[PDB]
Amino acid sequence: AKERPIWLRESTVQG
Amino acid sequence: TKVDEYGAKDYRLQMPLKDDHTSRPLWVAPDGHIFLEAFSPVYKYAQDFLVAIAEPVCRPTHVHEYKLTAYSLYAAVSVGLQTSDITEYLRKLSKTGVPDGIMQFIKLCTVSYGKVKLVLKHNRYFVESCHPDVIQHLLQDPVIRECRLRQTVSFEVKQEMIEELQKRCIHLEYPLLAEYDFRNDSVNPDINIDLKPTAVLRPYQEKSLRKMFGNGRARSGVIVLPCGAGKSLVGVTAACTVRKRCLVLGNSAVSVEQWKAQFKMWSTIDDSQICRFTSDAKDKPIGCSVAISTYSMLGHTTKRSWEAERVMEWLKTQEWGLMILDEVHTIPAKMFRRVLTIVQAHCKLGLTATLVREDDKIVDLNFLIGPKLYEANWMELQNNGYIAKVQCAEVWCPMSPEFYREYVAIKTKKRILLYTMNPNKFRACQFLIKFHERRNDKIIVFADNVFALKEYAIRLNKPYIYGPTSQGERMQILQNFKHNPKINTIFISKVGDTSFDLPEANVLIQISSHGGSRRQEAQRLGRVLRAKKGMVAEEYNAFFYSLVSQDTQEMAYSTKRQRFLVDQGYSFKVITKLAGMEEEDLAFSTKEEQQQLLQKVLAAT
Amino acid sequence: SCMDASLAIKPVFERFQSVIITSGTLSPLDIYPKILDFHPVTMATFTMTLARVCLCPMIIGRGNDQVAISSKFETREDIAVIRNYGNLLLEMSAVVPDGIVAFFTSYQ
């Protein structure tokens, strides 16, 4: 149902 | 003032600890800073009292902080509080107690209200007070005597020097109570403005007006609410309560039209009464009970045209019971502040959302309009569903090596174009628009640099709005964007950062900005902050993206301009990289394209 | 049309030694001697006493909009007031079991 994109949903930091 | 080893203001020798501190959620340092807890059972009661006496400094979701300033206290007495009531409740809330310095400070800035009053009648400004002694003290002051026109005692004062009088009155610890007794003013005819039953004001809207109309008389001040909270309705409701001729000062031709529509939507006033005074046209401002204009039109200093001059002559020679000043924070400008004296108004109501400025002139609103009557909490409204939930973000776009080679070396103010026109930044904007459009989201893109706005607009083939665009043309784009499904993304410039009502604009993107303008950032995020139809409180209905160039000066401004939003609890998640970009056919995928772009940017100079 | 009921009921009081006007849902007794010219011996109000509190009365003057819901003659034209009654009945119909009655003020 129009879920948020991956970058907004979960951290994109390598650490 | 004792400082610990870790550069910390040691306040242990100053105040004690209350035994029942667990229930009491308040701290009060001798510096005046007040740290309230948002998880305490008694938060709701403390916040309303605290926000009135102290203007919030930061309000994260857990622990809020406030600061006590003379202006902050002066607002408390105006609404109805008293030194005994404030200090007693403050001591009751304090889990450590009020230091003697603050206790006397609160008292000092409460014996100044009511001593002197300013009354406008029959196109004449008078300094009214029931105590002759305080008036005599003012007369001793040189500038106060200088601006004089050349039991209760009143001496007339020339209109042109109202500002200087008001500024000195505060400096003399005798604020002028510019309070309007509209209900006992039959001289000015009552207008047929009435609040239609279909219009119901939300609890914060009504609470703000309650402070404004705490007594029978109407109070003049600045009312602050988050962008999209509905300040138009509150402004309209203020006119309905006054029932007198109302002057509304928007920010641009777009502002007045939305003001006009809101009056029709939220009031019974007939279309004939509503009028506009703008360069585009005028709906017979000579005959009108409600006048809508812009600071630029009224504040214009050069000689006015015959069409505008005739209206200006009427405006000066009139008595207004309520002068709504939209975008108050622009008032303290050098010339826009003159509009207050040019027009004669009894009660000045100020509506705004970002009561912040990069200069120190924001405090001038205390006497130019009045004390900050109200300030709603953004998170409180966000959870209540009155304003859409926004997932702010900061997309870190690495700088192109060819560009950075030039950016590091170049320092003659040409950097702004260089890192504004970043091919890496462009691709992120290009990808984001494509993905979000596929999700049926109404995108808005901002850019301070018109050059960048034009470069991106044609390249993506999307409508763009900025200075030269005619009022009708820009108005057309908004209507298309509001309703036309085909127009899903629009480009806007500094013109449309304020007063643009786009309720369905879920997504926002920003590719440029004017330095660290917290006002610009918070205002820009406002466009998409309007409540959505199918909005859900905890679903992040709207989104905000501030594209930035890594390892660039834009990083410093990006942090600087996020100060206001974070103070209200908004968290700016950092996006180092965007997934799915590689598998997308985005522009500037070859060094030749990027090489061509860099040369053009250099050519612009 | 007459104006006072005491005239026609006067013979009843005189002819008969005592009359007991037993009634339910009675608005306060003191008015009836004013409306009807008689001197009651007692004015007793009885409240039913049961192991279980059968009746559960309530008054709903405010709706979801927290707007006055009084069906005033001038306020009768309000759409919100009309909407509120429909909202109340709609919501109540969901919970109220089979059997329910709604009373208005007039046919029009």
Next chain:
DNA sequence: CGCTGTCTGCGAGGGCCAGCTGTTG
């Protein structure tokens, strides 16, 4: 030959950043 709409310069102003003096330890 006149009147109205479009477009292009003059002049001014808002907002913010950066600078060479003025001032203080």
